[PDB]
């Protein structure tokens, strides 16, 4: 439909908590080829965050059952693999939109940091369930997306920009959970928090950036414990 009609349906689907519908409408918006507005970009992000988040949550449950259990164990394994297939298909859909439309069309550093962070995120979700010989390649794909976003954000954005702060948050999470590097995770998080604290008198985004700062410090306390 009209790009603006699909966006209106996405907002309706969001209020109804029907995130498959919401993602289908924002995928259709993206496939029209035009650069996304900040509102449309957020709607796409929120929709797929919820669609993949349900699979991530169910995966964690079933994988823990498998490890706390022989007939029962193989039953859980086949169910985990079913969820994994759903999860991988969701993240491959997002990564394809990123490679084909979002990243090449991004004109400004803010939107490019945003999409490269999203690329790091969905490769990270792929790494969360990857095993065997595919993992190292997937993990490095996540790291390289985060790293490029991290470098652009540090040069073009202020320490208090919520997109820069959210990238540092997820990059530190990548270091802690995927690379099993706790000291680099807390180093990255502490610097982002401290540099934002130092510049809190030049904020426009106050709660959006301070909410991320609270998550940074909460993670720091948990990982230092």
């Amino acid at each position: 439909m009209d790009k603006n009609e699909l966006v209106q349906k996405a907002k309706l689907a969001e209020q109804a908590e029907r995130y498959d519908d919401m993602a289908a409408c924002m995928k259709s918006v993206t496939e029209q080829g035009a650069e996304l507005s900040n509102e449309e970009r957020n709607l796409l992000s929120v929709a797929y965050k919820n669609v993949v988040g349900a699979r991530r949550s169910s995966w964690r449950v079933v994988s823990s059952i498998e490890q706390k259990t022989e007939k029962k164990q193989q039953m859980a394994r086949e169910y985990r693999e079913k969820i994994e297939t759903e999860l991988r298909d969701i993240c491959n859909d997002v990564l394809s939109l990123l490679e084909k439309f979002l990243i090449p069309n991004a004109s400004q550093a803010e939107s490019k940091v945003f999409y490269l962070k999203m690329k790091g995120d969905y490769y990270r979700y792929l790494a969360e369930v990857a095993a065997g010989d595919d993992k190292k390649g997937i993990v490095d794909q996540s790291q390289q997306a985060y790293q490029e976003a991290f470098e652009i954000s540090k040069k073009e954005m202020q320490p208090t920009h919520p997109i820069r702060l959210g990238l540092a948050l997820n990059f530190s999470v990548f270091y802690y959970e995927i690379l099993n590097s706790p000291e680099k995770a807390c180093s990255l998080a502490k610097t982002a928090f401290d540099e934002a604290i130092a510049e809190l008198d030049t904020l426009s985004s106050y709660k959006d950036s301070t909410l991320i700062m609270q998550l940074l410090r909460d993670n720091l306390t948990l990982w230092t414990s």
Binding site: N42, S45, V46, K49, G53, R60, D121, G166, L169, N170, V173, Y176, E177, D208, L211, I212, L215, D218, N219, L222, W223
Partner: peptide, 10 residues
Amino acid sequence: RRTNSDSALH
């Protein structure tokens, strides 16, 4: 999992 990512805000 008690670790939080940016998704906790959207």
